[PDB]
Amino acid sequence: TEVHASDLTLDRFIDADTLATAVNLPGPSPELRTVLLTGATGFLGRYLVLELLRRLDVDGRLICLVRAESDEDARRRLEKTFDSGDPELLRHFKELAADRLEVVAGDKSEPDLGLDQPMWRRLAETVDLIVDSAAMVNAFPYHELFGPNVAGTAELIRIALTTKLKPFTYVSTADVGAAIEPSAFTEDADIRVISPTRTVDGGWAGGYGTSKWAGEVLLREANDLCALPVAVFRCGMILADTSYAGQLNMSDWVTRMVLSLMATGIAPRSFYEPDSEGNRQRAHFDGLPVTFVAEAIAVLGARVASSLAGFATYHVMNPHDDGIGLDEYVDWLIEAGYPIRRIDDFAEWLQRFEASLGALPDRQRRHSVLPMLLNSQRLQGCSAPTDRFRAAVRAAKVGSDKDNPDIPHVSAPTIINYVTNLQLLGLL
Fold this sequence. Notes:
CATH architecture: 3-Layer(aba) Sandwich
Protein name: Isonitrile lipopeptide synthase
Family: Belongs to the ATP-dependent AMP-binding enzyme family.
Shape: globular
CATH superfamily: NAD(P)-binding Rossmann-like Domain
Strand order of the largest sheet: 4-3-2-5-7-10-14
Assembly: monomeric
CATH topology: Rossmann fold
Helix content: 25-40%
Radius of gyration: 22 Å
Number of helices: 15
Structural class: alpha/beta
PDB class: ligase
Distance between the termini: 42 Å
Keywords: GxxGxxG motif, Reductase, lipopeptide
């Protein structure tokens, strides 16, 4: 069935009194004291916990909405996130969280975020910035129910419109642009103009692209109606990195592939079409380390709450023409001494690869790329533009290198860290 942008109007989710008051609500406080974060337990979210606490002053407070039976159960579920076989991760967390961290039980999709009236009112009064982080990022079994998704974003927008206007940071995805003409899929575009309609299946469930799309559309509406300051971050593939050990996005294509290449021992000569002379063509994989992405999001979203007016979208992606793609990742694994070899003919590799995945133990096979079965050599970022995000990264000096700040390149230790992590997790 078809869902239209024109149908995702705020009046269908938020009461008129709230919407009317919001037009005359005082514009945001330029002071960043209290931040509300959703999805703190997620892969990206846990990194945003760390980065948002770093941005906050000694008088600052981060409030994490977490799914649980009680606040004790929520605070513990999040404590366990940073107690994952790395003592340095736990030490940074505890230090940064000390007296500045509040964790509350609740569901984004439930009315009032599943919170008591006094808590909800307190949040509406005090919150200076809302950060809406996708609990699942880049997952293969991505199957989100559209109803609860959309209702959730509307509930966050509602708290952003209630007592004072709140800057809203929304984690989105590059997949929003899957069905859109490449020239039209830009950072400046109104998502409602360039993508007026989508589809869901018969069970009202949507793919990653459609899920985030609806959120962007609703935020555009909040911007039109009420001048809500909004920052949308469309992320590409987000990579585990070496900041901490043991932090893996198990369900994404990359983690599954590294697992599949390792456990099978076999890679192809090239993942991409060879040239006329049969040789390996320059390629680029669009991946960013999670540390960078969390930092970028925390820094660029937090500065709206300075007091930057307007609707902003950023393409959080790796746009370098650096010749660093899937074949290089394989090169790095081989060079590190891992038991992986390559078959010349892509076609043979693929027949053997599929067969060999079928021979693996139950758990491995399940967390591999084998379920994703449905092709052929790839083709080669430079697809989607990154002008706004790149300028913002350089302007805000996002990253370690404060002299030449830029979007990083993927290097070998990041890839090797995938196998290291998979071993600690028992999967290899």
